Design a protein around this ligand. Structure first.
Ligand SMILES: *[C@@H]1O[C@H](CO)[C@@H](O[C@@H]2O[C@H](CO)[C@@H](O)[C@H](O)[C@H]2NC(C)=O)[C@H](O)[C@H]1NC(C)=O
Ligand SMILES: CCCCCC/C=C/CCCCCCCC(=O)O
Length: 227
């Protein structure tokens, strides 16, 4: 229709509400070919983010505002998480190939989004096709210990394993940084606390106040009851 359930196959597992209509087959074709060429070449947290982002890009959520059907673009925070953290390495490698006129063969009209041009999430009806990449997994959050690599460690440990004070995430001195982006919920009020918001390190970590130690893991005990 204008707003209707997703009628395709490739994104069946990722799309749960109404999506925008009016074409729809062209986006199914392209997404299917990209699943084979691009998605299947990705791994780990990048792959997880990319699948959700690709489906939300290709089949935007739809909602009614009075009599008008509204297409919801991607969210700034999800895009930031994907571009600057989860998929940064793969994203840079694609962009560098594009500079040499080497393109993903199956991209069709699809293009990597510019995160800065997208709405910031939140509002009973969302302004974007929110996927939640920056959110905490509540059951895995911990405070006095870490579950596994501590991706969702939210404690107040504020020195590295050798005792160096952490630099604040919201400051660019002594170490300048663009990743992890501060849209991750671990970092919104991250103070100078050890964090593993990207989930790629084996331990929570921080940039340190020592000019000669850009970043270092913190030393946090495993949670007694973590398996
Ligand atoms: C991605 O989008 C942002 C947001 O619009 C662009 O930032 C603008 O850049 C232009 C220069 O072309 C400036 O005149 C504007 O002041 C910027 N706007 C904002 C809101 O920051 C950015 O240039 C885009 N990135 C690319 C590579 O095109
Ligand atoms: C590693 C990047 C994974 C994609 C991240 C989410 C982006 C979804 C939009 C679809 C982009 C499809 C590839 C387009 C390639 C290009 O810009 O030339």
């Amino acid at each position: 229709g204008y707003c209707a359930p997703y009628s395709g196959k490739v994104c069946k597992e990722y799309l749960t509400g109404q999506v925008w209509y009016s074409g729809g087959w062209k986006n199914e074709q392209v997404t299917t070919a990209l699943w084979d060429e691009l998605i299947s070449d990705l791994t780990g947290l990048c792959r997880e983010a990319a699948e959700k982002m690709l489906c939300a890009y290709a089949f935007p959520n739809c909602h009614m505002e009075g009599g008008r059907a509204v297409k919801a673009p991607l969210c700034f925070e999800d895009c930031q998480a994907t571009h600057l953290q989860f998929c940064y390495n793969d994203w840079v490698l694609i962009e560098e190939k594009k500079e040499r006129n080497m393109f993903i063969k199956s991209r069709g009209h699809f293009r990597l989004p510019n995160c800065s041009s997208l709405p910031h999430y939140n509002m009973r009806r969302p302004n974007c096709s929110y996927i939640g990449l920056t959110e905490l997994k509540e059951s895995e959050v911990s405070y006095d210990c870490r579950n596994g690599n501590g991706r969702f460690y939210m404690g107040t440990m504020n020195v590295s394993k050798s005792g160096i004070p952490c630099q604040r995430w919201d400051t660019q001195y002594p170490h300048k940084h663009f990743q992890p982006p501060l849209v991750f919920h671990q970092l919104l009020e991250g103070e100078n606390y050890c964090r593993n918001a990207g989930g790629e390190e084996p331990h929570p970590w921080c940039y340190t106040v020592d000019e000669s130690v850009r970043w270092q893991h913190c030393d946090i005990p495993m949670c007694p009851d973590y398996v």
